[PDB]
Short mmCIF file of N, CA and C and ligand atoms in Angstrom, two decimals:
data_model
loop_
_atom_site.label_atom_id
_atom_site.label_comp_id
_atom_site.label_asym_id
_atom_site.label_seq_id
_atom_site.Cartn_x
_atom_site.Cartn_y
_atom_site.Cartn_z
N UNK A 3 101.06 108.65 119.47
CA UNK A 3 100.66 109.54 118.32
C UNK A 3 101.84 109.69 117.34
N UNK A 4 103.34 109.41 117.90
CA UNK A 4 103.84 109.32 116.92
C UNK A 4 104.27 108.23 115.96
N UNK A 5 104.24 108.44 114.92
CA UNK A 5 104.38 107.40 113.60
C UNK A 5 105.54 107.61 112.91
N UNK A 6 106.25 106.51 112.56
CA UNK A 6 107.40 106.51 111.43
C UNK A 6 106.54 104.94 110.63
N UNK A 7 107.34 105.84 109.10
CA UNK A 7 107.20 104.67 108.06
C UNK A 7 108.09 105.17 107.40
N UNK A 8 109.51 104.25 107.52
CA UNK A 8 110.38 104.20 106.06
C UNK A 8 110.95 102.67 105.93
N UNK A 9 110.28 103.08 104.22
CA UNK A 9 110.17 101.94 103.73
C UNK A 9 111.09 102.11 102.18
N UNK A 10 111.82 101.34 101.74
CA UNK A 10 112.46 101.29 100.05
C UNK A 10 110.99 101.84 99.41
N UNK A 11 111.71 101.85 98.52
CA UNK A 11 110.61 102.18 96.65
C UNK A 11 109.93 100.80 96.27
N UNK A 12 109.40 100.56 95.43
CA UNK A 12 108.85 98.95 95.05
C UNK A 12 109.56 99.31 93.32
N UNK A 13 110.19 98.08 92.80
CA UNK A 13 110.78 98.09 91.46
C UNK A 13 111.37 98.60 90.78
N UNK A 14 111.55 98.28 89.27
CA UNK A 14 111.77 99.42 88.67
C UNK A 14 113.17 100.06 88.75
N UNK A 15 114.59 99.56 89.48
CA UNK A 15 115.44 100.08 89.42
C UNK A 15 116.98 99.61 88.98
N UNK A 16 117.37 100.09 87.97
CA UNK A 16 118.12 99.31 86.99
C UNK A 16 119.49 99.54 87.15
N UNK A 17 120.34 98.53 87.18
CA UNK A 17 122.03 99.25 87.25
C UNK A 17 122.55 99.92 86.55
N UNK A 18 123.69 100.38 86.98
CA UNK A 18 123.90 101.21 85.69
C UNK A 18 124.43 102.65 86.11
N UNK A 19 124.50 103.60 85.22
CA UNK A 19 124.25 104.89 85.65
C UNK A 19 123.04 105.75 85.21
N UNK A 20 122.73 106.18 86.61
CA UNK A 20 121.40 106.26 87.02
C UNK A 20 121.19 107.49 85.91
N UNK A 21 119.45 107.85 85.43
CA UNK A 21 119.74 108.97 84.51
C UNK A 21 119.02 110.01 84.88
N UNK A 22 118.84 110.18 86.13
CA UNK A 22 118.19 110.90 86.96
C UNK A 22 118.11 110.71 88.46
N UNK A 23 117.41 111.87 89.69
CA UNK A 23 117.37 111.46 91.19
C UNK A 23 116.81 110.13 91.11
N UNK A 24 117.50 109.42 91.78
CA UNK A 24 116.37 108.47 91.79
C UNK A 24 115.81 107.44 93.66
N UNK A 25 114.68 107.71 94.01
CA UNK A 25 114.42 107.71 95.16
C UNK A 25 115.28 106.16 95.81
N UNK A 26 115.69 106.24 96.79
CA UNK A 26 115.73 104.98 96.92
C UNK A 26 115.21 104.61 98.42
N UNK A 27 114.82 105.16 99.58
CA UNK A 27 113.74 105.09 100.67
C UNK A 27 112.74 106.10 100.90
N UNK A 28 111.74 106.11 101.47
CA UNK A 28 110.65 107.26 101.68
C UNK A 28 110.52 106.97 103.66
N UNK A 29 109.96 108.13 103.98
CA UNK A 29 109.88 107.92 104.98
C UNK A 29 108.83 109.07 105.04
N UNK A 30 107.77 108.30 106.28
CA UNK A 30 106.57 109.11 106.70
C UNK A 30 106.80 109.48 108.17
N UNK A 31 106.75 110.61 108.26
CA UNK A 31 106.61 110.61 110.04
C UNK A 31 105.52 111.30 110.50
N UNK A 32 104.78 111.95 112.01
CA UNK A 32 103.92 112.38 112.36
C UNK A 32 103.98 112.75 113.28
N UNK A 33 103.35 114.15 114.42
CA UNK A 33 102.83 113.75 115.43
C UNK A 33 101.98 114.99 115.76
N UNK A 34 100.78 115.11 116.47
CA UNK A 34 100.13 115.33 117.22
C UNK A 34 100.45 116.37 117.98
N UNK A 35 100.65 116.07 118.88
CA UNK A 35 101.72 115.73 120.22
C UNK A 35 102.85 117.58 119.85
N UNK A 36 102.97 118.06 120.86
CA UNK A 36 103.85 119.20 120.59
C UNK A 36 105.79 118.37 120.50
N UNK A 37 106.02 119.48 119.57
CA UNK A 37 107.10 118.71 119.14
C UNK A 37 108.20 120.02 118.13
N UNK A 38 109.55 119.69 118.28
CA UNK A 38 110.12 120.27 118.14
C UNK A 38 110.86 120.42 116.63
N UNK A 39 111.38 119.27 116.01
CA UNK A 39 111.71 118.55 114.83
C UNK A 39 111.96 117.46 114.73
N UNK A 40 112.58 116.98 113.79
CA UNK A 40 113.10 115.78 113.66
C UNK A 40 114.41 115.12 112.92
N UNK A 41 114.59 114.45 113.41
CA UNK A 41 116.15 113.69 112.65
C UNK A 41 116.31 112.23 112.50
N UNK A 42 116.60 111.72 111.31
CA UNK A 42 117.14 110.81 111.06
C UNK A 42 118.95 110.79 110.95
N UNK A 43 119.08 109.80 112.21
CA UNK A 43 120.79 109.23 111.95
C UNK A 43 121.00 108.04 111.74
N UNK A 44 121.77 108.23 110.27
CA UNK A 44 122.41 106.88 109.93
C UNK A 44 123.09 106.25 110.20
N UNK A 45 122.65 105.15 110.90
CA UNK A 45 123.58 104.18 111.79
C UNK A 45 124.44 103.48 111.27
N UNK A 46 124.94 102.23 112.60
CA UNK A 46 126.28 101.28 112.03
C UNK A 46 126.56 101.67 110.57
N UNK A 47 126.39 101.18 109.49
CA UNK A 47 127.12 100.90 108.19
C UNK A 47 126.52 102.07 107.64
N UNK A 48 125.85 102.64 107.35
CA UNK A 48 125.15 103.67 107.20
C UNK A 48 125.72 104.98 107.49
N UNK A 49 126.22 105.59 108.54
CA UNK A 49 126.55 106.36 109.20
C UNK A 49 127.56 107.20 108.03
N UNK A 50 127.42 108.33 108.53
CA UNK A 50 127.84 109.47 106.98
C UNK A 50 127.03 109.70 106.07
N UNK A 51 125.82 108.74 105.78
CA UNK A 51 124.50 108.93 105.06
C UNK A 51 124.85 107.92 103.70
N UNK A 52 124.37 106.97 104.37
CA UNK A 52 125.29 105.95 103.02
C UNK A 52 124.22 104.32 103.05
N UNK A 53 124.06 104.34 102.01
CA UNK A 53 123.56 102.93 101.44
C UNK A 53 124.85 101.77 101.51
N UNK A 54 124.81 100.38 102.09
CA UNK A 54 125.82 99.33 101.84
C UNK A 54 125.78 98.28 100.99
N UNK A 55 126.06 98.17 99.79
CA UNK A 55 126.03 96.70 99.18
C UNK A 55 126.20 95.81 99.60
N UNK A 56 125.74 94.55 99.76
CA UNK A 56 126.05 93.43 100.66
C UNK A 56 127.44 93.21 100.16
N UNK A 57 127.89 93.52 99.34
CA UNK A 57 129.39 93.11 99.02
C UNK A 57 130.67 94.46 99.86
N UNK A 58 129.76 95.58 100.03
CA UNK A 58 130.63 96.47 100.95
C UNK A 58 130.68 97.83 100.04
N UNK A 59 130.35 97.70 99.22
CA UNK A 59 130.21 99.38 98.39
C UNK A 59 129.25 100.18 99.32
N UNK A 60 129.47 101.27 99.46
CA UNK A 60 128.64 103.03 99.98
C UNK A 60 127.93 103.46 98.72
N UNK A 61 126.87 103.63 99.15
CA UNK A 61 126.31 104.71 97.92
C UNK A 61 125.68 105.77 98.88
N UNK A 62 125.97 107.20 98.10
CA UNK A 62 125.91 108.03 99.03
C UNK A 62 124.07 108.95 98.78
N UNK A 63 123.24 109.04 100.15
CA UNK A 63 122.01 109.23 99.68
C UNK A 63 121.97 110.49 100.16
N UNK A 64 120.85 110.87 99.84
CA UNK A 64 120.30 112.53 100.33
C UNK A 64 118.95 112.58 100.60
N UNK A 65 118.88 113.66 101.06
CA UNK A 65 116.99 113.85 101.71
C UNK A 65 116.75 114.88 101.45
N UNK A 66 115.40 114.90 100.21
CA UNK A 66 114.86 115.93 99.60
C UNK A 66 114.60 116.59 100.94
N UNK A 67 113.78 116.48 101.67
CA UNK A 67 113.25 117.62 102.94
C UNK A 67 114.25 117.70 103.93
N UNK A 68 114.94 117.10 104.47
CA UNK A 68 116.29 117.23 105.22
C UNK A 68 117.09 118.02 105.01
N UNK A 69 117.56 118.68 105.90
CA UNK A 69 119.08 118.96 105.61
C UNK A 69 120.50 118.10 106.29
N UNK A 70 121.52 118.11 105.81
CA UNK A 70 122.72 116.98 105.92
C UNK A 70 123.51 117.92 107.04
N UNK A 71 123.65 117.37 108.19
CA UNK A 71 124.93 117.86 109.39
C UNK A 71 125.69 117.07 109.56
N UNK A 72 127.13 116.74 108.82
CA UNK A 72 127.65 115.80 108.73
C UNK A 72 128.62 115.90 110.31
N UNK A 73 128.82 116.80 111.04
CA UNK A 73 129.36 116.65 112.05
C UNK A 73 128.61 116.15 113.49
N UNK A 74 127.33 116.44 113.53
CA UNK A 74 126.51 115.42 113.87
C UNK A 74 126.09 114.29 113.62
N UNK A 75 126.23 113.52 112.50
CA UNK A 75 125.88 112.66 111.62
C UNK A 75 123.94 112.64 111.94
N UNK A 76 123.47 113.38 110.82
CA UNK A 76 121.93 113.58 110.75
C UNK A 76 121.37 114.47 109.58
N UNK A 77 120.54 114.16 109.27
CA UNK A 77 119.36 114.83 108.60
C UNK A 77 118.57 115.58 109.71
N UNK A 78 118.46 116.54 109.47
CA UNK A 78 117.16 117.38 109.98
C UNK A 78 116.02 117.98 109.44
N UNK A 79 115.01 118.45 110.02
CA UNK A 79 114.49 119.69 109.90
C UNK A 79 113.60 119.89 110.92
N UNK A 80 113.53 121.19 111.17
CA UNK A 80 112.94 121.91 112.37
C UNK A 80 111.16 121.91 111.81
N UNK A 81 110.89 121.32 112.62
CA UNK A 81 109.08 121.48 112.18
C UNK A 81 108.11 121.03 113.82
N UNK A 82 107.03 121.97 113.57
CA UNK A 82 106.50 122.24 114.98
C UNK A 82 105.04 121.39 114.53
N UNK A 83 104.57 121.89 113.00
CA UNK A 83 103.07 121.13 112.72
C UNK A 83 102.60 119.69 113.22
N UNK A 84 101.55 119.81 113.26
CA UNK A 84 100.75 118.29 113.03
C UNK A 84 100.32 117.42 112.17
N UNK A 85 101.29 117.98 111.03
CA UNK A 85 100.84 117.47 110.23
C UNK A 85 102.12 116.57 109.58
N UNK A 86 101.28 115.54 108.72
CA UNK A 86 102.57 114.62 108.05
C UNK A 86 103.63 115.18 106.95
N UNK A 87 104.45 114.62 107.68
CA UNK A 87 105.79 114.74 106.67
C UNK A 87 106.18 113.63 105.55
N UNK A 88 106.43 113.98 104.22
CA UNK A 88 106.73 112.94 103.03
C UNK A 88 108.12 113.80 102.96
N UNK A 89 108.60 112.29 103.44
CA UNK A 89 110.52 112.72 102.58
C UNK A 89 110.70 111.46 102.14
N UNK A 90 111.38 111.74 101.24
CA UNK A 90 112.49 110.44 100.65
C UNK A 90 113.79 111.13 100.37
N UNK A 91 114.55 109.57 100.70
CA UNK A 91 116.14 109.72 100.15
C UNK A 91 116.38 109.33 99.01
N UNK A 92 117.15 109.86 98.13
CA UNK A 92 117.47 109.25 96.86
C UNK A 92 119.21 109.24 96.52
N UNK A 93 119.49 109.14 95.52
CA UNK A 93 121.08 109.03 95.33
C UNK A 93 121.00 110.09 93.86
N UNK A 94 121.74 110.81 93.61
CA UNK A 94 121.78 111.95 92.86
C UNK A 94 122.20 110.78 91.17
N UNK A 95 121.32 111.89 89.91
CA UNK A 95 121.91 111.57 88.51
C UNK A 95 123.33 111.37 88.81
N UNK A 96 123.65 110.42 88.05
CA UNK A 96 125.03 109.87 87.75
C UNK A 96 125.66 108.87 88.38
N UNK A 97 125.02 108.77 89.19
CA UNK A 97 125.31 107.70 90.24
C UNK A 97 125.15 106.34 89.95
N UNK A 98 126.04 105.19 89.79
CA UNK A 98 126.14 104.30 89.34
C UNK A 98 125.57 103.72 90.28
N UNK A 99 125.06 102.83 89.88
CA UNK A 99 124.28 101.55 90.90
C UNK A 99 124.34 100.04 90.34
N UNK A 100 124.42 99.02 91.00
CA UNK A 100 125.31 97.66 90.97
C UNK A 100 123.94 96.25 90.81
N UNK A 101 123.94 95.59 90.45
CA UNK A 101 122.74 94.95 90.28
C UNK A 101 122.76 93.89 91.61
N UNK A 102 122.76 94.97 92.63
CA UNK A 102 122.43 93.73 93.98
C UNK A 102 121.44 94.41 94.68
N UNK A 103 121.61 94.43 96.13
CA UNK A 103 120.96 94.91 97.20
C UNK A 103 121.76 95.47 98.21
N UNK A 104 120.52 96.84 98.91
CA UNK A 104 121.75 97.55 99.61
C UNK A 104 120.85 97.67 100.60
N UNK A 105 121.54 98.07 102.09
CA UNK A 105 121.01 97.64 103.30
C UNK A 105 120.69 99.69 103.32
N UNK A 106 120.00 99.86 103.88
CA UNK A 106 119.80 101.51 104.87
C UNK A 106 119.21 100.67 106.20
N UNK A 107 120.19 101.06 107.60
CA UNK A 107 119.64 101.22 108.31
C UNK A 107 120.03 102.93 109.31
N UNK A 108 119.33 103.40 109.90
CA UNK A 108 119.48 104.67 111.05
C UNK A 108 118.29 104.44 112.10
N UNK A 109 118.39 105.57 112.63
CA UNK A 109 117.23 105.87 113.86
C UNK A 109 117.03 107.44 113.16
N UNK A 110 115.48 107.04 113.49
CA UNK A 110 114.49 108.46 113.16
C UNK A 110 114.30 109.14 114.77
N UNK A 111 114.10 110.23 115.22
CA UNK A 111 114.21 111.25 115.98
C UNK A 111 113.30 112.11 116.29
N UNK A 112 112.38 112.19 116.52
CA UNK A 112 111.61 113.27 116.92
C UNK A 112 111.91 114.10 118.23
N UNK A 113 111.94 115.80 118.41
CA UNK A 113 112.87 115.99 119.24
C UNK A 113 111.74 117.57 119.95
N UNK A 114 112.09 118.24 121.07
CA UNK A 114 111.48 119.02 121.51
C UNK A 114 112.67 120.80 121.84
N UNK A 115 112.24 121.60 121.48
CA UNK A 115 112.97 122.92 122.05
C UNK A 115 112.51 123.23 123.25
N UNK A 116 113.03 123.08 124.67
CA UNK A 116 112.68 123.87 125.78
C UNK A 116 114.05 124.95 126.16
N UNK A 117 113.33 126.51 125.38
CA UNK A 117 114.80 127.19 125.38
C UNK A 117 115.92 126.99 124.88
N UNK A 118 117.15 126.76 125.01
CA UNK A 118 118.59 126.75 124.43
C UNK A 118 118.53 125.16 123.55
N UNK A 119 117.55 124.13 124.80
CA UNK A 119 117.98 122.96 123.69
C UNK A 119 116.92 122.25 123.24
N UNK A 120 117.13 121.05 122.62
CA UNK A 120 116.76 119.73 121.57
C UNK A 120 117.01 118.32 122.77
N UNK A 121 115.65 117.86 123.44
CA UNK A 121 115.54 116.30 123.64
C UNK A 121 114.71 115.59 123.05
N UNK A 122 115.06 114.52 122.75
CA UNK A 122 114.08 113.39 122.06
C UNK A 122 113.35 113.14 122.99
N UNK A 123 111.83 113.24 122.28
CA UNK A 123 110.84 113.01 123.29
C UNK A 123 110.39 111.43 122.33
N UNK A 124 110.89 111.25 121.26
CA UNK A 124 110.43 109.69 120.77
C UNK A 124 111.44 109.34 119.81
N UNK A 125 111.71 108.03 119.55
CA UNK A 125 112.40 107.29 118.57
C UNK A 125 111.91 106.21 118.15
N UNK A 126 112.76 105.77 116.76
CA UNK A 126 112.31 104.60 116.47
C UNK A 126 113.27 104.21 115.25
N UNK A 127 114.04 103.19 115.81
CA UNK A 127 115.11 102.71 114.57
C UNK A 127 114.58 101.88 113.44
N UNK A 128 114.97 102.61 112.12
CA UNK A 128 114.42 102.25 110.91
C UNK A 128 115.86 101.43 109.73
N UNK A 129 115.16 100.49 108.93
CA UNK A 129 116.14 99.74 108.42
C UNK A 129 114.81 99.78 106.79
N UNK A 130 116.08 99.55 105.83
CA UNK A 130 115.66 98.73 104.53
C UNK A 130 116.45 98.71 104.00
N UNK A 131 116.16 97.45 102.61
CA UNK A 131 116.64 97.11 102.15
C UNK A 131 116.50 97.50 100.30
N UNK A 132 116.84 97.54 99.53
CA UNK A 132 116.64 97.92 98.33
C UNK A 132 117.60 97.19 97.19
N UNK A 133 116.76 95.97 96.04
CA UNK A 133 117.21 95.08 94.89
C UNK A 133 117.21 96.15 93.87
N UNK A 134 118.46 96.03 93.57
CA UNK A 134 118.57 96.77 91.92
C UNK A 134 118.98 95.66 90.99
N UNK A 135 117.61 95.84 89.86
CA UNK A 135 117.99 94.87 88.87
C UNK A 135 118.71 94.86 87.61
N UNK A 136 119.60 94.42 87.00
CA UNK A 136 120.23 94.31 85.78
C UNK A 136 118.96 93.88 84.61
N UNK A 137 119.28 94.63 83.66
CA UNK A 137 118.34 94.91 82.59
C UNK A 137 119.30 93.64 81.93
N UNK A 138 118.82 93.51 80.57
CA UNK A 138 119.63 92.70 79.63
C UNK A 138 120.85 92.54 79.80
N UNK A 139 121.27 90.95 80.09
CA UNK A 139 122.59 91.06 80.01
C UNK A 139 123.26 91.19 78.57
N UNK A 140 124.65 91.40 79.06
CA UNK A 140 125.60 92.20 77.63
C UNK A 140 126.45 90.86 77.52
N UNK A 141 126.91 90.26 76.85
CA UNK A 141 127.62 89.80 76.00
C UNK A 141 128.27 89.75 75.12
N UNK A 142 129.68 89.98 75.26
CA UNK A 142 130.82 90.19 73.79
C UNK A 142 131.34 89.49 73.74
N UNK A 143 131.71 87.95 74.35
CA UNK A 143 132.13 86.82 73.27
C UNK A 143 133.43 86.94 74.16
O1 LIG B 1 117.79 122.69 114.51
C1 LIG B 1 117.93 121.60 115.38
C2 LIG B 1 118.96 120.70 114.76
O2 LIG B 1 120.20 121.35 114.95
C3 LIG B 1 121.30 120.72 114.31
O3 LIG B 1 122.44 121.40 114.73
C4 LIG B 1 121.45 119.28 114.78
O4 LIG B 1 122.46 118.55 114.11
C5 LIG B 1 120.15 118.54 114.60
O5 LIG B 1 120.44 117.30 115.16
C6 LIG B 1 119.05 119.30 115.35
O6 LIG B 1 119.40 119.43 116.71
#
């Protein structure tokens, strides 16, 4: 019963500096099933909450419905419903972005409270990838 979907954005995203949030993965999760919250941690290259350029640049993302525990390395939020969750990560206005591709991978978390603590009762490691395209090239001779 439980479901993850995170997946990039489709198009549409130009280098540059950005002139607004601008999403750069979504992720669906779900369950049924009694349940405690959930977390996404950003793994290998990722880890600290970070997009990688194949050339080695960080771009640093955030999660509208999450909150950031950087001493855990995770996104959270505490949710008991059955019902689906829509989050996406994006990278904040101003944020320059490079006309390549950048890797996100982590593990998503679904987790249970019995009293004092938090066990994962499911997982499922999530990856994407995301092309940013260069608009007109510039030329000065
Ligand atoms: O509220 C439960 C959450 O508590 C935070 O301290 C922790 O980093 C998350 O991973 C999750 O356990």
């Amino acid at each position: 019963t439980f479901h993850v979907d995170f997946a990039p954005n489709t198009g549409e995203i130009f280098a540059g500096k950005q002139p607004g949030d601008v999403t750069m993965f979504t992720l669906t999760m779900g369950d049924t099933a009694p349940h405690g919250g959930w977390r996404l941690i950003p793994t290998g290259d990722s880890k600290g909450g970070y997009m990688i350029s194949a050339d080695g640049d960080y771009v640093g993302l955030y999660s509208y419905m999450m909150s950031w525990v950087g001493i855990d390395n995770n996104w959270y939020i505490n949710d008991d419903s059955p019902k689906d969750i829509k989050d996406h990560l994006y990278v904040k206005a101003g944020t320059v972005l490079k006309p390549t591709t950048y890797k996100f991978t982590g593990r998503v978390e679904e987790y249970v409270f019995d009293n004092k603590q938090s066990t994962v009762i499911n997982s499922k490691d999530v990856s994407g990838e995301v092309t940013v395209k260069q608009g007109l090239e510039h030329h000065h001779h």
